[PDB]
Design a binder for this molecule. Structure first.
Ligand code: MET
Length: 526
């Protein structure tokens, strides 16, 4: 299937201001999207805001403003944040959008017609902060804003409350076997692997039916009405998850505004998602509820769900006196640099840790000393006297060993990007960058200028090509810096994307370097 590559971030609750968690998830989404665009594919990358529900409406009430005003303002803050972070997301969806609501109603009605929605009761615990139903085994004792003895979620630590309401119920229990079939037939559909195992374990134990409506009073009437029953509202999570289906169906203009909802998702060739990027905290909603809904509706399932960890700063919980502002740190250290760090410092299996110390260490060691150094050396007037890509002479075995690494890199990085495992992709590229540096050091091209100009041609060419290829594969990570690098190397635009240009030798000898003006990454004081 030649289709539009469709990658999503979660849609974020607007109870609070954008923070590192949201920036991180959307970064991952952005990177995946960028890699598929550099690969030459059609791409649609989606992010946005989750605007209905009890949680949001209570947040509005606390700020003493209407839910409508509150959500529009906070959505505005999210949009500004993502603009500032220099992402390349194709559309920003809001669940208050009228087209989204129409899709929610269609999906609901499809589920109901299928016989998978019935009128029942939920009597049990509920975390308003996670909009999550919990069993008694997932709660325990704790404290609230006052410090009174309450119940809290084992998962999140947020206060839970007992709910007893007549609710539309979705027959989730009936989907156990089909979900297990899906997990097992598609053993790469959840990443990383240990999270896939967690999901399978949970579904094996059995599934209860799921409340998909709430009484309108409970949600302060801030939600989508149930079709044919105005006394009930659609569960915020059914509403929310449906964003991916809505997004897959919106025609978007040049300015990024939604102009049309298509009837059939196939018309835009996006659904279902190739990658849903999420935090570990919402895995059950995406790997269990979502596919069950899609199975009921007869809709295709997503290819991959990738679930990441949470950040800490200085080994401590990120208000409490430990702020981590990504815009602030990007202004201090550089946007590409901070992005690189977030993506390199930890894998999707880990809870990453930020500190200025280790940020500087990676900036200086990897970006400046390994990458930047190499870029300056091969473009330097001292070494590259003609300011061009030279024509190589005959290759030694040592030359061939480096060339082989450069040739193998795209295939290796490609597999990692598709997992997806961006950390391993970065590490693979930097392994090759370190080898190129070692080669340059062994060959001492600065001496060759006077001693053996023929040999220098060969060394310089291989080095330039290694820098081009590594930089191409790093361009989704360092989108702005990659352009600077290509400009220094004089790589024509046509050669900055497309799988054809993953091949060693794509830029011909005689190509002129860009003019000199200057540092790529400036090292910071320890
Ligand atoms: C369908 S993605 C919804 C994510 C949810 N709003 C959250 O912030 O946790």
């Amino acid at each position: 299937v030649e289709k539009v590559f469709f990658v999503t971030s979660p849609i974020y609750y607007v109870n609070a201001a954008p923070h590192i968690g949201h920036v991180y998830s959307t970064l991952i989404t952005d990177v995946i999207g960028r890699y598929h665009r550099v690969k030459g594919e059609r791409v649609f990358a989606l992010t946005g805001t989750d605007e209905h529900g009890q949680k949001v409406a209570e947040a509005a009430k606390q700020k003493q403003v209407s839910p409508y005003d509150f959500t529009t303002a906070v959505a505005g803050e999210f949009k500004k944040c993502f603009e500032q972070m220099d992402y390349s997301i194709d559309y920003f969806i809001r669940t208050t959008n009228e087209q989204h609501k129409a899709v929610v109603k269609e999906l609901w009605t499809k589920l109901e017609q299928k016989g998978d929605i019935y009128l029942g009761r939920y009597e049990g615990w509920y975390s308003i902060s996670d909009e999550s139903f919990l069993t008694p085994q997932n709660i325990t004792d704790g404290v609230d804003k006052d410090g009174n003895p309450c119940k809290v979620s084992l998962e999140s630590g947020h206060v839970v409350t007992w709910v007893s309401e007549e609710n539309y119920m979705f027959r989730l229990s009936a989907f156990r076997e089909r979900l297990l079939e899906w997990y097992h037939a598609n053993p790469g559909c959840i990443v990383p692997e240990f999270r896939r195992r967690e999901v399978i374990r949970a579904v094996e134990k059995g599934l209860p039916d799921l409340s998909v409506s709430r009484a309108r009073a409970t949600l302060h009437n801030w939600a989508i009405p149930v079709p044919g029953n105005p006394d009930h509202c659609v569960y915020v999570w059914l509403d929310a998850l449906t964003n991916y289906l809505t997004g897959s169906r919106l025609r978007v203009d040049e300015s990024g505004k939604e102009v049309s909802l298509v009837d059939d998702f196939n018309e835009l060739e996006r659904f279902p998602a190739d990658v849903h990027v999420i935090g570990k905290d919402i895995l059950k909603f995406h790997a269990i509820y979502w596919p069950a809904f899609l199975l009921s509706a007869g809709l295709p399932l997503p290819k991959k769900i990738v679930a990441h960890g949470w950040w800490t700063k200085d080994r401590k919980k990120i208000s409490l006196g430990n702020v981590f502002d990504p815009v602030e740190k990007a202004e201090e250290f550089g946007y590409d640099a901070l992005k690189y760090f977030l993506l390199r410092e930890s894998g999707f299996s880990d809870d990453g840790d930020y500190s200025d110390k280790n940020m500087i260490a990676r900036l200086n060691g990897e970006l400046a000393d390994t990458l930047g150094n190499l870029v300056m050396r091969c473009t330097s007037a001292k070494i590259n006297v003609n300011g061009e890509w030279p024509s190589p002479a005959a290759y030694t075995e040592e030359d061939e060993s480096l060339i082989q690494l450069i040739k193998d890199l795209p295939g290796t990085a490609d597999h990692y990007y598709l997992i997806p495992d961006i950390q391993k992709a970065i590490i693979a590229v930097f392994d090759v960058l370190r080898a190129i540096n070692a080669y340059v050091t062994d060959m001492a091209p600065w001496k060759l200028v006077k001693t053996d100009p023929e040999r220098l041609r060969t060394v310089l060419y291989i080095t330039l090509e290694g820098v081009r290829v590594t930089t191409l594969l790093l361009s989704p990570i360092l989108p702005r810096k990659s352009v600077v690098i290509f400009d220094m190397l004089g790589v024509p635009e046509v050669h900055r994307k497309g799988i054809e240009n993953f091949e060693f030798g794509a830029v011909p000898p005689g190509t002129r370097l860009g003019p000199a003006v200057e540092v790529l990454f400036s090292k910071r004081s320890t």
